[PDB]
């Protein structure tokens, strides 16, 4: 049929909750809403069965858009490389969404901490860069300090100092939480020590170990000498072996896997150290953990000033554009303009 401007055809109602029943809709009525009459030449249908329940997924993208629609709005992956990368790009957007609601709004009241910031407009000096804790987290902070002031005042950076301050401040946020879902969110902003990030490098290391014995099996069977920790070199040796025998055109040059074994050993030593302070078992510390506690405190001291240094960089540009134009003034110079200050013929 063809429509006319200003003239509409009145149609009878079905008398079933209107067009959308606000009281509810049953299964067989929503079954027809599920399998909506989309054109199947451009519609992909998908379902997954997980034991008791199953989930249906139907997507349709029209033909009149794919020359102008965005790559993010229509995440079409015409390759296996774009499939694996596009799934990982959409996973990081979803995972920050379901974790980001745990510590901000729509979260538990003990899982919401705030920061105060005051920056001077003239001296560019940061004043009152503290956290806004409750009374339970502040009882943890003086319990940390009164033990550490009892041990470090007999020997040895001044009197009124906070020993390992960025380590206990990062542990006081974790100590005051009441949900485990918001606890790992605070672990992620503190150098990424959450259990989902640590489990990915454990899988990346165990696959490098399982590939290290693969190169060890090939080189021993071909000849019938090696570096110390071969699983760091194992993605670099496998990339050349697959390039040499003919299955693979590109060998790798990326040396980011160097030192990865002791790195994730330090990351798991940083993780087990911080939860040792959450359970307040810091009265006994081995020499391996104490050298880890010193380097973790200075690493956690610079990650909370990431946002304040970017604002400090903008404030340097603001005072730069307010400077006097030209080469300068005659009253505010110790050096002549046309001469270098260290020139031997400086004074004419």
């Amino acid at each position: 049929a063809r429509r006319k401007w200003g003239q509409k055809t009145w149609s009878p109602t079905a008398t079933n909750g209107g067009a959308a029943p606000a009281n509810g809709v049953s299964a067989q009525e929503a079954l027809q809403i599920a399998y909506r009459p989309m054109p199947p030449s451009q519609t992909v249908e998908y379902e997954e069965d997980f034991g008791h329940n199953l989930m249906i997924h139907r997507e349709y993208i029209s033909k009149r858009c794919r020359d102008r629609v965005s790559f993010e709005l229509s995440a079409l992956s015409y390759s296996n490389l774009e499939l694996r990368r596009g799934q990982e790009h959409l996973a990081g957007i979803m995972n920050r969404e379901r974790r980001g609601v745990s510590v901000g709004a729509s979260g538990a009241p003990d899982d919401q901490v705030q920061m105060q910031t005051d920056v001077d407009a003239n001296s560019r000096e940061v004043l009152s860069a503290r956290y806004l804790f409750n009374e339970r987290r502040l009882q943890f902070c003086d319990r940390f300090q009164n033990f550490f002031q009892s041990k470090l005042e007999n020997s040895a950076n001044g009197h009124e100092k906070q020993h390992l301050f960025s380590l206990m401040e990062a542990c006081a946020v974790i100590f005051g939480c009441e949900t485990e879902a918001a606890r790992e969110t605070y672990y992620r902003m503190f150098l990424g020590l959450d259990s989902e990030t640590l489990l990915e490098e454990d899988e990346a290391l165990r696959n490098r170990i399982a590939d290290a014995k693969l190169v060890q099996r090939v080189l021993e069977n071909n000849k019938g000498n090696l570096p110390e920790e071969f699983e760091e070199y194992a993605p670099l040796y496998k990339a050349y072996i697959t390039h040499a025998v003919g299955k693979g055109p590109v060998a790798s040059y990326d040396i980011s896997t160097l030192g990865s074994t002791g790195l994730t050993a330090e990351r798991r030593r940083w993780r087990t150290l911080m939860e040792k302070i959450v359970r307040e078992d810091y009265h006994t510390m081995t020499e391996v953990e104490q050298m880890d506690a010193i380097v973790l405190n200075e690493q956690l001291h610079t990650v909370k000033f990431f946002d304040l240094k970017i604002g400090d960089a903008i404030r340097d540009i603001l005072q730069l554009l307010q400077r006097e134009t030209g080469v300068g003034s005659s009253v505010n110079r110790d050096t002549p303009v046309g001469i270098s200050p260290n020139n031997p013929e400086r004074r004419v």
Binding site: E324, T325, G326, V327, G328, S330, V331
Partner: peptide, 9 residues
């Protein structure tokens, strides 16, 4: 002329 100050120029 850029060698003078902004108050002078």
């Amino acid at each position: 002329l850029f060698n003078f100050g902004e108050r002078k120029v």
